[PDB]
Amino acid sequence: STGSATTTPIDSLDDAYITPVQIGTPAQTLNLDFDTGSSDLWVFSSETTASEVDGQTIYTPSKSTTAKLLSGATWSISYGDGSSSSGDVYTDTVSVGGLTVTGQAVESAKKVSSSFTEDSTIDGLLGLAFSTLNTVSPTQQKTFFDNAKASLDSPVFTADLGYHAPGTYNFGFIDTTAYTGSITYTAVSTKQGFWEWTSTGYAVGSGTFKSTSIDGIADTGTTLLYLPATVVSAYWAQVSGAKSSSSVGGYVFPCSATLPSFTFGVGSARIVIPGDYIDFGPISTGSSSCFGGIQSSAGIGINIFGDVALKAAFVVFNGATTPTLGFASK
């Protein structure tokens, strides 16, 4: 089997991407944030505290003939941005792009933090990291990918995120029309439950490439590119008037600037992030200070190749017995 679904930016900045997902029978379609940095499939639901729902579409298990309470199971998750959610668990039929899993754990939120409530466009998350990170207790549950894997034509999914445009998540096949050149594969460590890999270095604009190992994660659920302070300082030093602002919470730059590109290494291959991908616009409406898309990881504990990086590539998440990541230009 295979599946193929379009993913759409939630706003003009590409702050996140939403992908329609069918849950239950008859189908209830929710728009979920596919997140390769977490491992829970959770949704706004009929159980979510009413004051914490503001425009989201909800999953109502009582209206699904295939929903079953997963008795005694609870979940609770905290993300890198400080957001959180928790609740109970149903099993139900879940389909993405024509690919169906029966008996998928659908984590129904009873509570969500303010950042979720305030984002009316995101109806929940679909985790695509390793199932070792799933938070369901007392019986950990599998991701949609892990449950689909044995049925897929190839045990892979691909992320093809758009810059200010829709893109695609495919399951079970590699669309050889969707990228240019060849795919470079690189090793993955699953020790922390992430798609963790080591970049071979970076360049700023037309500058020379610096060969250096940068361990980090491929995380579709993170907007920006978070790298070591040395790398980030080297990038922003090439932008007149850029500075790190403790009041704003990262590097800002004059909105009048033209940003340089940023290149990262994948083995001997190179992915180039155009400068415009690094512009996240005014820090507040009407400001002439703009927020940078490359930020320091120093206060995180991990480097994160988020959407800023991943949208410059066609990315293969190879879930074979020995997982690997692949990157191609596009």
UniProtKB/Swiss-Prot annotation:
Family of this protein: Belongs to the peptidase A1 family.
Domain of life: Eukaryota
Catalytic activity of the protein: Hydrolysis of proteins with specificity similar to that of pepsin A, prefers hydrophobic residues at P1 and P1', but does not cleave 14-Ala-|-Leu-15 in the B chain of insulin or Z-Glu-Tyr. Clots milk
Organism: Cryphonectria parasitica (Chestnut blight fungus)
Protein name stated in the entry: Endothiapepsin
Keyword Signal assigned: yes
UniProt KW keywords: Aspartyl protease, Disulfide bond, Hydrolase, Protease, Signal, Zymogen
Cystine residue pairs: 255-290
GO molecular function annotation: aspartic-type endopeptidase activity
E.C. no: 3.4.23.22
Record domain Peptidase A1: where: 17-328
GO biological process, alphabetically ordered: proteolysis
Residue positions of the active site: 35, 199
